[PDB]
Amino acid sequence: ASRLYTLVLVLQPQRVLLGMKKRGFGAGRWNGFGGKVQEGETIEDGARRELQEESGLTVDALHKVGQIVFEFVGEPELMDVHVFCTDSIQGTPVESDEMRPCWFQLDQIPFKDMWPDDSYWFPLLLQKKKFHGYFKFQGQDTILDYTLREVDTV
Ligand SMILES: Nc1nc(NC2CC2)cc(N2CCCCC2)n1
């Protein structure tokens, strides 16, 4: 059994939009925008909601780019993250209670201050290849196992 999560990456030709998480799960790490999927909304609905809540931004189209399943040692529920990207956004990203947004050149992505799995799967995101990932964490910082694959359908 897994819990659904969203992750939205605004990936333009020369830069990626990330947010510094100010509170809650993942505070202190840069990441794309997302969170738990609620009862009563589609996964993509929840993705749009978390983008708007955390950055003020809305988008015309979201594209499925990946799925990553996480196991945490001693935690019974797996976490199922659905990753989306978009290239065009509506509005200017602005700070919220959860996230401080900044653009990053693609050669200056802050991997040391991101989730450790990002350094593994971000290359596939940037080559615009669809992927399935699996990571076993011990705590929040230690990857014990992982698998990573490109897929034809996310
Ligand atoms: N890039 C990223 N890496 C993750 N690794 C898991 C914690 C060890 C989770 C995650 N998200 C889950 C919470 C919402 C935002 C997306 N996003």
Curated annotation (Swiss-Prot):
Reported effect, T153A: Reduces 2-oxo-dATPase and 8-oxo-dGTPase activities and increases thermolability
Keyword set includes Metal-binding: yes
Residues annotated for 8-oxo-ATP binding in this entry: F25, F33, G34, G35, K36, E50, E54, W115, P116, D117, D118
Tissue: Widely expressed with highest expression in thymus, testis, embryo and proliferating blood lymphocytes.
InterPro entries: 8ODP, Nudix_hydrolase, NUDIX_hydrolase-like_dom_sf, NUDIX_hydrolase_CS, NUDIX_hydrolase_dom
Chain sites annotated for binding Mg(2+) 2: E50, E53
Pfam families: NUDIX
Domain Nudix hydrolase: 1-130
Effect of I43K: Loss of activity
Annotated phenotype, changing D45P: Loss of activity
Binding-site positions, O(6)-methyl-dGMP: T6, K21, N31, W115, P116, D117, D118
pH dependence of this protein's activity: Optimum pH is 7.8-8.2 with 8-oxo-dGTP as substrate, and 8.0-8.5 with 2-oxo-dATP as substrate.
GO biological process terms, semicolon-separated: DNA protection; DNA repair; purine nucleoside catabolic process; response to oxidative stress
Binding site for 8-oxo-dGTP: T6, K21, N31, F33, G34, G35, K36, W115, P116, D117, D118
Binding residues for N(6)-methyl-AMP: T6, K21, W115, P116, D117, D118
Effect on the protein upon substituting L51P: Loss of activity
Cofactor notes: Binds 2 Mg(2+) ion per subunit.
Positions with a binding annotation for 8-oxo-dGMP: T6, K21, N31, W115, P116, D117, D118
CDD domains: NUDIX_MTH1_Nudt1 (cd03427)
Record has GTP-binding as a keyword: no
Substitution effect: F25A: Reduces 2-oxo-dATPase and 8-oxo-dGTPase activities
Keywords: Cytoplasm, Hydrolase, Magnesium, Metal-binding, Mitochondrion, Nucleus, RNA-binding, Transit peptide
EC numbers, comma separated: 3.6.1.56, 3.6.1.-
Name of this chain's protein: Oxidized purine nucleoside triphosphate hydrolase
